[PDB]
Amino acid sequence: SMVRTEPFQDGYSLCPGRELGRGKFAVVRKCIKKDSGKEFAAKFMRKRRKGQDCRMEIIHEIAVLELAQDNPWVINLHEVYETASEMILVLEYAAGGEIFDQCVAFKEKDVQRLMRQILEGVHFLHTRDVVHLDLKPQNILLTSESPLGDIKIVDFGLSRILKNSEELREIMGTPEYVAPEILSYDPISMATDMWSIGVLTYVMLTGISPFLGNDKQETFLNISQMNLSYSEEEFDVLSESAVDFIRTLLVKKPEDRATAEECLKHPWLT
């Protein structure tokens, strides 16, 4: 991006009242562009994290946001500002929008429409070699609560650009020397994103987090070993294709998971 050094508050007024949202290292405040009147969402991101300069982390997010600028299901970046301590990303504001988590279950018809949107944005990122790694409701924005509007994906702080066939060739090295715990490893890939989409689909249709256990080692144990049954009362009014769609994503072996492309052709969404 072009990075502006003139004071942010000369072009924008900050809206009064509570912030939109607050991640670690970032605060989102609704604002108004003075000579315009238009609403935007201003993402204040500290450049320092645990004493270290992390400007490059903000630069990475801008780069992803820009890669995705013609993706209609990713939030638009309008402008970037820089102070000594902060960087400010001025992002588009969904007038009347909402985080999908505060909107709460959904009708199967509404999840079908919404998941096709999510999967098209994810599919677009994945063809750009970007894996999101944080697809969850806190990061899925609805342009309208009532009626249900369109999804925008809004944060990319855990996102990565991934390598191709080099992953399992030049990295692994000469096969006769590889240790057996490497052969058994599954690295973070585009299928990691699809697991999360399978978890969100489940949550969206039933109101149940499928692997939520009693403690955290239960939650972690359910993720590793629980074979879901889809036999809950909440599934009686759900279509067979909806359950097959989830079964296609919540596969433990990453290589067996459906890709976003195949999801978009699954009979459930077509």
Ligand X SMILES: CC(C)(C)NC(=O)c1ccc2cc1OCCOCCNc1ccn3ncc-2c3n1
Annotated binding-site ranges: 20-28, 43
The stretch among 16-24, 174-182, 193-201, 257-265 that binds ligand X (CB under 6 A) is: 16-24
End-to-end CA distance of the chain: 38
Return binding residues for ATP: 20-28, 43
Q: Provide the H-helix boundaries in 93-173.
A: 108-126
Helices and strands in the chain: count of H runs, count of E runs? 7, 14
Q: Identify residues 104-163 at the interface with ligand X (CB under 6 A).
A: 141, 154-155
Under 8 Å between Cβ of 139 and 167: no
Q: Minimum CB separation from ligand X for residue 214, in Å? A: 28
The stretch among 92-100, 199-207, 228-236, 245-253 that binds ligand X (CB under 6 A) is: 92-100
The stretch among 3-11, 19-27, 178-186, 254-262 that binds ligand X (CB under 6 A) is: 19-27
Q: What is the distance between the alpha carbons of residues 45 and 98, in angstroms, rounded to a whole number?
A: 21
Q: Minimum CB separation from ligand X for residue 43, in Å? A: 5
Among 8, 12, 20, 126, binds ligand X (CB under 6 A): 20
The stretch among 23-31, 78-86, 185-193, 223-231 that binds ligand X (CB under 6 A) is: 23-31
Among 88, 91, 190, 204, binds ligand X (CB under 6 A): 91
Q: Which residue has the tokens 């270290």?
A: 52
Question: What SS3 state is found at 152?
Answer: strand
Angle between helices 190-206 and 240-249 (to 10 degrees): 150
Among 7, 23, 72, 173, binds ligand X (CB under 6 A): 23
Cα–Cα distance list, 232 to 119, 143, 214, 249 (Å): 26, 31, 18, 18
Is 134 among the catalytic positions?
yes
Catalytic residue, chosen from 10, 53, 110, 134, is 134
Q: Minimum CB separation from ligand X for residue 188, in Å? A: 20
Cα–Cα distance list, 213 to 174, 230, 247 (Å): 41, 16, 20
Q: Minimum CB separation from ligand X for residue 190, in Å? A: 21
Under 8 Å between Cβ of 8 and 42: yes
Q: Minimum CB separation from ligand X for residue 103, in Å? A: 10
**Does 99 engage in binding with ligand X (CB under 6 A)?**
yes
Task: Look up residue 258 and give its DSSP letter.
Answer: P
Q: Identify residues 29-88 at the interface with ligand X (CB under 6 A).
A: 41, 43, 75
Tell me how long the chain is: 270
Among 12, 81, 93, 202, binds ligand X (CB under 6 A): 93
Q: What is the distance between the alpha carbons of residues 188 and 88, in angstroms, rounded to a whole number?
A: 30
Number of residues that bind ligand X (CB under 6 A): 17
Sign of the dihedral defined by the CA atoms of residues 70, 74, 79, 84, in that order: negative
Residues that bind ligand X (CB under 6 A): 20-21, 23, 26, 28, 41, 43, 75, 91, 93-94, 97-99, 141, 154-155
Catalytic machinery residues: 134
